[PDB]
């Protein structure tokens, strides 16, 4: 297909949030960019940063909003317009509370799972019909509010597994791109 594909990883800006649960999308987007030797650059027409390349013979545009998670959509929308990418050809990688820690699933449309970033994207795109690479982080402990949970770094136990989980998520994204 000649149509461009837009892979978006979701996450908050700053070192304080780089290793948090809510930033898995950013981690996978970097992995993907590293894999195809592409480097992220400022995109002033959207405000996000972009990295370009090719996968499975397809034109690929990787992106990470530079604003806060709750405002992700306002950067992704203008980004899709710039590359004329239809919502359906947009793939967003995100952490998911409704899936067990480490479980990766694919899906087009459906709910936001309580993710404030997805909520933002759906609003900006005017639809829920965009692809998603869901990366399970598990339900939050009863002692913590869900918003606080996603803004914490993974436990030492989980941390040991995060690296392979991201490789798997990056792999699932590539397979998705191919099929």
* Cβ 9 vs Cβ 92: under 8 Å: yes
CA angle 104, 106, 112 (to 5 degrees): 95
> What CA–CA distance (Å, rounded) separates 131 from 109?
7
Tokens of 60: 């690929």
Short-list 125, 98, 93, 124, CA closest to 111: 98
Instruction: Enumerate residues 6+ apart whose C-beta is below 8 A from 36.
Output: 53, 54, 55, 60
Pair of tokens at residue 138? 């598990």
- The tokens for 103 are 């479980």
Decide if 22 is catalytic. Answer: yes
Residue 56 tokens, joined: 């499975």
- Resolution to one decimal, Å: 2.0
- Give me the sheet containing 90-96, strands edge to edge: 41-42, 49-55, 58-64, 5-9, 90-96, 131-136, 104-108
Determine the Cα angle at 113 with ends 147 and 89, to 5°.
Answer: 120
CA distance 74 to 70: 9
The β-bridge relationship of strands 90-96 and 58-64 is unpaired
d(CA 107, CA 156): 29
Of the candidates 84, 74, 82, the one whose C-alpha atom is nearest the C-alpha of residue 125 is: 74
How was it solved?
Answer: X-ray
Tell me the backbone φ, ψ of residue 174, rounded to 5 degrees: -65, -45
The string of DSSP codes covering the chain is --S-EEEEE----SHHHHTBGGGHHHHHHHHHHHHTT---EE-TTTSSEEEEEEETTEEEEEEE-SS-GGGTHHHHHHHHHHTT--GGGEEEEEEETTS-TT-EEEEES---TT-HHHHHHHHHHT-S-SEEEEEE--PPPTTS-HHHHHTSBPPHHHHTTHHHHHHHHHHHHHHHHH-
Q: Which residues make up each annotated binding site?
A: 17, 68, 70, 116
Selection from 155, 116, 110, 152 nearest residue 133 by Cα: 110
Q: Where are the domains of the chain?
A: 1-179
Residue of 22, 43, 94, 115 marked active site: 22
CATH topology of domain 1-179: Rossmann fold (3.40.50)
Give the C-alpha separation, 50 to 171, whole Å: 20
Instruction: Count the Cβ atoms, other than its own, within 10 Å of residue 116.
Output: 17
Annotated binding site for tRNA: 17, 68, 70, 116
CA distance 112 to 96: 9
């Amino acid at each position: 297909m000649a149509e461009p594909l837009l892979v978006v990883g979701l996450g908050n800006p700053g070192a304080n949030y780089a290793r948090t649960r809510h930033n898995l999308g950013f981690v996978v987007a970097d992995l993907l960019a590293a894999r195809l030797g592409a480097k992220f650059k400022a995109h002033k027409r959207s405000g996000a940063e972009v990295a370009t390349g090719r996968s499975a013979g397809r034109s690929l545009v990787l992106a990470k909003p530079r604003c806060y998670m709750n405002e992700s959509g306002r950067q992704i929308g203008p980004l899709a317009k710039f590359y004329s990418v239809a919502p359906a050809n947009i793939i967003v990688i995100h952490d998911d509370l409704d899936l067990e820690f480490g479980r990766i699933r694919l899906k087009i449309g459906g709910g936001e799972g309580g993710h404030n970033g997805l909520r933002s994207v759906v609003a900006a795109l005017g639809t829920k019909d965009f692809q998603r690479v869901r990366i399970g982080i598990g339900r939050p402990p009863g002692r913590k509010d869900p918003a606080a949970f996603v803004l914490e770094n993974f436990t030492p136990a989980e941390r040991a597994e995060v690296p392979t989980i991201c490789e798997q998520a990056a792999d699932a994204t590539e397979l998705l791109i191919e099929q």
